């Protein structure tokens, strides 16, 4: 479950007493008792007041952060730390616009480890005004990922192996090197 319910010491934007008629608002027991009913309805009005915040990934409770992952397919699995999820879901939509792009591949690994990589890609981009001029680019495909981790625990090679597996465009080989 989630262990939600009532919250002590929370006010309401719609006091029950404030909607009572005049003259009725003069009693001691009626005003105190009917204000007690505000306790049960207190947190519902908070939700409707701040429903917009309940959708921003940077602020919503942890449960909805994973749910907001399935909103736009953010790869929520495998992470057992809340702060790691916080960046992933918000930055997921930007990544999917550059899947298979040098910046996109570099950012994804950077996103999952916190440090920028040092990649070399088999090719590039260069023009030439010469008619039917030759185009350079490495003769054979090759993808390499280098990570400058400070504390290379011997599990990051597999983690980089799994992570870069989806980033590569199912087209060319690859290798994983971790500091």
């Amino acid at each position: 479950a989630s262990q939600r319910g009532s919250v002590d010491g929370l006010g309401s934007s719609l006091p029950i007493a404030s909607m009572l008629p005049a003259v009725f608002a003069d009693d001691d027991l009626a005003l105190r008792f009917v204000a007690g009913l505000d306790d049960v309805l207190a947190p519902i009005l908070n939700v409707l007041d701040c429903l917009d915040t309940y959708f921003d990934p940077a602020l919503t409770p942890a449960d909805f952060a994973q749910w907001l992952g399935t909103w736009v397919g953010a790869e929520t699995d495998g992470t057992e730390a809340e702060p790691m999820l916080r960046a992933a879901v918000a930055a997921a939509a930007r990544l999917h616009r550059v899947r298979g792009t040098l910046q996109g591949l570099s950012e994804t690994v950077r996103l999952a480890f916190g440090v920028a990589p040092e990649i070399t890609e088999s090719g590039g981009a260069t023009w030439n005004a010469r008619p039917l001029g030759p185009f350079p680019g490495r003769p054979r495909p090759q993808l390499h990922v280098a990570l400058r981790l400070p504390e290379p625990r011997p599990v990051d090679v597999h983690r980089l192996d799994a992570l870069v597996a989806a980033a590569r465009p199912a087209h060319m080989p690859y290798t994983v090197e971790v500091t």
């Binding site: 939600r4 306790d39 736009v72 597996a165 199912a170």
Partner: protein
């Protein structure tokens, strides 16, 4: 996925925290404390996130997949050489048995075709590599000649005359004969029948007849392919019909006493024309255009059927009508193109919108019809559904008895007919279009886009293959068709081989949206059969017969190609079968006390040869386990 976790029984009673009324169950104020209305609020509160989910989806712009209409091919036989007129009425709905528990799926004869009452022209005979040089005219009535020279030479051909050739139908040719001495079995005669067309030569199908060919007088009912064009059959005007002759063909019967030719008459029994499971709406106006951009126009029939010219509306230009293209999304439009988008699951047509740019100006994506012009919808397709796939062609209202023609035949089961996707299904489709954005690029999208291209496949997974000699490696995709327990347990095999359609269809969709210059491979994974044999001693007060029955299937269940393993789903494409893991299955079987030893016997569905006995089988990554028949010894004091 939820906001609050209260219910009606959840009563706080915090009045004592402010007041001093001290009865847990008082007269009436407990009733006052009873607030069901909160329960009727929180229940409606918990469903808000789902409503918001369906809310922002429209902001993203994803829609529902329109249903596609099942299509079938039907043939209007006549059983008479007559009806020199249009033998195809558009419509003529035919359905199944109108049972009260299942809806009789109806159809509609869509297209039209015209045939000709053709008559035989010339009648010739020739063999492989040798010209006709025969009667070629008098064979129509007399001057009998042995057919095919009574020899199965490779390339023997017969040219037969057919005056006023029919470009598209199925016909028969009467070449009577007097066959004696040897009678060739009707099953699979070694001949290939062919007809001339614009492109050249093309194979013609056959149909039912009471004779096996030259083993009794009668006809042969060829299926003339489309594109048949006339020629010069000497003294007549006839299209060319060809009869290729093959060798004994690994023992197929052939005659050396081939019969002669008695007479000639051409029947032209019937024609061929497809039909689909969808109605049509013709020339229905939908409104008058206004000069403003971004207009949305409705229609009168909700579930519009998919198709490339889905609606094909026309605007009233000064030259008749001007047609409009259809694009799924408007981002690809141009400030001068003629594009629309259609939400076919509800029947909306929306022209190009106008977007304010960063400069404060306007970027009109897609042109707008001129003010006051007439907007008209030409054609519709409504209908389609999962039930649109007929079974075996047994429409059962196949119109056996008709007064116009003899019979209308629908043999081959209809294809297509994908049902419209549910709203719940769309939620599981939202991430895919939010990350792939079409044009599958990496390994994950190939797995997902395969399902979207064709979801009738049981399961798909994509693995890189052997490397190309230039340093790359072409993409490989594995297909496992949906299987049914055809034999008595286990599986029949030859059902896991796709029928040349799933390989074609999936590849065709992927090729258009793919990285250029990279080859794609599709096929089934590697397979090899594995058999478990052991000896399990039963308990002293159990029926070994049930133990014998139970242990043969429970051990088998662990090796199921489609739903095996401990998870109960398909195998993970690389898990190696082992006795130790199968030792877990063996121990749990009821009516057992201990097991002696288990022997594994690898094999194949191709070769009955079996492999050497080994405990551990090395299974390749793009491969799956095949479970065979097996026996184990149950020796024990059974009851």
């Amino acid at each position: 996925q939820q906001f609050v976790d209260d219910a009606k029984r959840y009563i706080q009673q915090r009045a004592p925290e402010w007041t001093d009324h001290n009865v847990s169950d008082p007269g009436v104020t407990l009733v006052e404390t009873v607030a069901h209305m909160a329960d009727q609020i929180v229940y409606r509160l918990n469903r808000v996130p789902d409503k918001n989910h369906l809310a922002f989806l429209d902001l993203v712009g994803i829609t529902l997949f329109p249903p596609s209409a099942a299509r079938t091919d039907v043939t209007f036989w006549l059983s008479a050489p007559q009806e020199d007129a249009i033998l195809v009425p558009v419509g003529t709905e035919v359905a199944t048995l109108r049972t009260e528990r299942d809806e009789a799926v109806v159809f509609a004869t869509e297209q039209d075709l015209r045939i000709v009452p053709c008559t035989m022209g010339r009648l010739v005979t020739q063999v492989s590599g040798e010209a006709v040089s025969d009667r070629t005219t008098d064979l129509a009535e007399s001057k009998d000649v042995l057919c095919f020279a009574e020899a199965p030479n490779p390339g023997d051909c017969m040219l037969i005359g057919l005056s006023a050739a029919v470009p598209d139908c199925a016909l028969a040719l009467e070449l009577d004969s007097r066959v004696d001495g040897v009678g060739v079995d009707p099953r699979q005669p070694p001949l290939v029948w062919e007809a001339w067309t614009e492109d050249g030569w093309q194979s013609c199908e056959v149909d039912r007849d009471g004779t096996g060919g030259l083993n009794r007088p009668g006809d042969v009912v060829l299926h003339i392919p489309g594109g048949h064009v006339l020629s010069r059959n000497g003294g007549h005007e006839a299209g060319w019909i060809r009869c290729r002759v093959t060798e004994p063909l690994s023992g197929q019967p052939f005659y050396t006493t081939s019969p002669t030719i008695r007479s000639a008459e051409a029947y032209t029994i019937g024609g061929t024309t497809g039909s689909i499971h969808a109605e049509t709406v013709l020339d229905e106006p939908l409104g008058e255009s206004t000069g403003l951009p971004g207009q949305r126009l409705r229609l009168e029939h909700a579930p519009v059927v998919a198709g490339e010219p889905s609606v094909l509306l026309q605007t009233a230009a000064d030259d008749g009508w001007q047609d409009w293209q259809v694009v799924p999304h408007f981002s690809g439009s141009h400030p001068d193109d003629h594009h629309i988008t259609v939400d076919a699951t509800t029947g909306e047509i929306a022209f190009g919108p106008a977007v304010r740019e960063a400069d404060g100006t306007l970027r009109q994506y897609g042109a707008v019809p001129p003010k006051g012009a007439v907007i008209r919808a030409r054609r519709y397709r409504t209908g389609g559904g999962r039930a649109g796939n007929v079974a075996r062609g047994a429409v059962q209202v196949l119109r056996t008895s008709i007064p116009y023609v003899s019979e209308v035949v629908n043999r081959e089961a209809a294809l297509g007919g994908v049902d419209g996707e549910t709203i719940e299904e769309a939620k599981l489709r939202a991430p895919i279009t939010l990350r792939a954005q079409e044009r599958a690029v990496t390994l994950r999208d190939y797995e997902e886009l395969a399902r979207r291209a064709a979801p009738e496949t049981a399961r798909i997974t994509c693995l890189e293959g052997a490397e190309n000699e230039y340093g790359a490696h072409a993409v490989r995709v594995l297909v496992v068709p949906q299987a049914v327990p055809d034999p008595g347990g286990r599986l029949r095999f030859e059902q896991l081989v796709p029928g040349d359609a799933l390989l074609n269809r999936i590849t065709r969709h992927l090729d258009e949206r793919r990285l250029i210059g990279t080859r794609l491979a599709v096929g089934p994974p590697y397979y090899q059969g594995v058999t478990v044999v052991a000896t399990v001693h039963a308990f002293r007060d159990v029926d070994a017969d049930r133990v014998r029955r139970q242990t043969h299937d429970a051990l088998y269940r662990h090796l199921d190609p489609l739903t095996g393993g401990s998870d109960g789903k398909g195998w993970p494409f690389g898990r190696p079968v082992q006795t130790g893991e199968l030792f877990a299955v063996l121990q749990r079987v009821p009516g057992v006390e201990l097991v002696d030893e288990v022997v594994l016997h690898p094999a194949d569905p191709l070769t009955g040869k079996r492999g050497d006995p080994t405990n551990r089988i090395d299974l390749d990554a793009p491969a799956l386990v095949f479970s065979y028949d097996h026996r184990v010894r149950v020796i024990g004091d059974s009851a």
